[PDB]
């Protein structure tokens, strides 16, 4: 009756949105990282009554379907229509919504895996549906497929689970530092992203390396005009303590960086001494977890 | 400043819904008729102010965007975003909404043609956009493309304007009788329609004839389970006065029939003597009209 799923938070380094009217053919190209910190989804399922009820909650509080539309879209599709009883989905996030961590993808996939497990289905069907729910509601283009890949992911062929190709990079003794400030809140950037994004991808596929990705990221965040002065200034001070250059979480107001244990300390002293908020998450190398909640 | 467009009402004899996530590739197969009675759309456009305003009205009364979503979708896309002034769209219907006459397609296409004319564009782009607006809002699958064909239309290849193929049948001294009662209001019919619909199409393409279409229609409305007993009974009494068999407006509660002037009279005496409502519309053989409203 109690199923739990964990979906790591996903951060994008640089991207190229490939929009497509066909959900499965819709996606993006780019690179990103997955965190040991993310979303935990719990599916409580009780049979009974003369009715079919689906409730959703965000961090302990019930939410209207209107704020939960993506999760609901996923739930209505997986919970049988002849089914009688109560389905409850409790989601817990390690990050605020709208900060670029892909919580909505976490809720979509987490719900799809937990509910497919309880009512029947497969990994692929769950993933496609969560991808589909993301696309149809403008939730995200590569968080779901990115989360399914784990570790440091690279989307080389646009599309949803099943149709697109992602690759993974090897890395050593790396952790993820994040400075989440807030939500990000033209026609030239749509052009710039198209051109810089694809360029970054090509470069990364030339040199498959986490170090290179961060450099290619920083250049991307800057040559597109996406990087705000307020962040750029924080970056200039951050980069002075790290071997690898920090960069902008893609479509949030924050920065992230791949760091080593020792640097991390310095980065803390520095950041905290700037009244700036910071989190440290391990790179989640595994795949999304799903299973009967037994502890 | 005042542009008028006329889109004939469209009635479907039998169909096959071909759903597709790609608007343009979405459509249907089937046959239908266009009426001299339909929708008149008037686009009043005034430049000025420091703001962009779009208002819509149905039969003289202003309507919220929520009831006008399809027209609004079309209007927001055609009215420039840098545009300052007031755009007003007045739609007038010759039939009630939800009765199977395709008013929503009339509003979509009528608005798209009138606004493309005023702000720039082409017939095809207007048609595709109205088709797209219909599909995205579950407005209809073949009314727009059907209205663009005029007369007695046959959709042989599914799709939106541009991509799909429609054919037209020849006919002689035929008029259209309609008995609009109300709105129509499983999984077996989705199966039946798939199989009977395509069968009807194949048969019609064997014998391209309006007489044959009505017979193939009646058989379709019945072998699918779509035809309600209340209509079927009215049909049995109607068919006794007409040479050609009456049939169900597709997805409404009413019937229609191709009739000759003399029969029409009998059909009136009979119908009126049954407390039943009836309309007579000529088969609109032309194409949708658009142009500066000059009378
Ligand atoms: N676009 C910006 O992107 C952010 C919303 O996407 P975000 O990167 O924060 O992930 P999310 O909301 O947790 O999940 P999802 O990407 O699936 O919608 C907001 O700051 C918004 O202004
Ligand atoms: N489905 C049924 O179909 C009807 C709605 O489609 P209808 O054939 O009446 O055309 P419409 O509403 O005027 O325009 P559109 O088909 O573009 O939505 C309703 O009776 C509904 O119950
Ligand atoms: Ca947690
Ligand atoms: Ca460590
Ligand atoms: Ca679509
Ligand atoms: Ca009128
Ligand atoms: Ca006549
Ligand atoms: Mg979001
Ligand atoms: Mg309708
Ligand atoms: Na997340
Ligand atoms: Na990896
Ligand atoms: Na109409
Ligand atoms: Na014709």
UniProtKB/Swiss-Prot annotation, chains A, B:
GO terms for biological process: coenzyme A biosynthetic process. Moderately stimulated in the presence of potassium cations. Inhibited by increasing concentrations of pantoate. Activity is not affected by CoA/acetyl-CoA. One of its GO terms (molecular function) is kinase activity. Pfam families: GHMP_kinases_N. It comes from the Archaea. Optimum pH is 7.5. Optimum temperature is 80 degrees Celsius. Keywords: ATP-binding, Coenzyme A biosynthesis, Kinase, Nucleotide-binding, Transferase. Pathway: Cofactor biosynthesis; coenzyme A biosynthesis. It catalyses: (R)-pantoate + ATP = (R)-4-phosphopantoate + ADP + H(+). Disruption phenotype: Only viable in the presence of CoA or 4'-phosphopantothenate. Coiled coil: none annotated. The keyword ATP-binding applies. It is an enzyme of class 2 (transferase). Belongs to the GHMP kinase family. PoK subfamily. Homodimer. NCBIfam families: panto_kin_Thplsm. This is Pantoate kinase. It comes from Thermococcus kodakarensis (strain ATCC BAA-918 / JCM 12380 / KOD1).
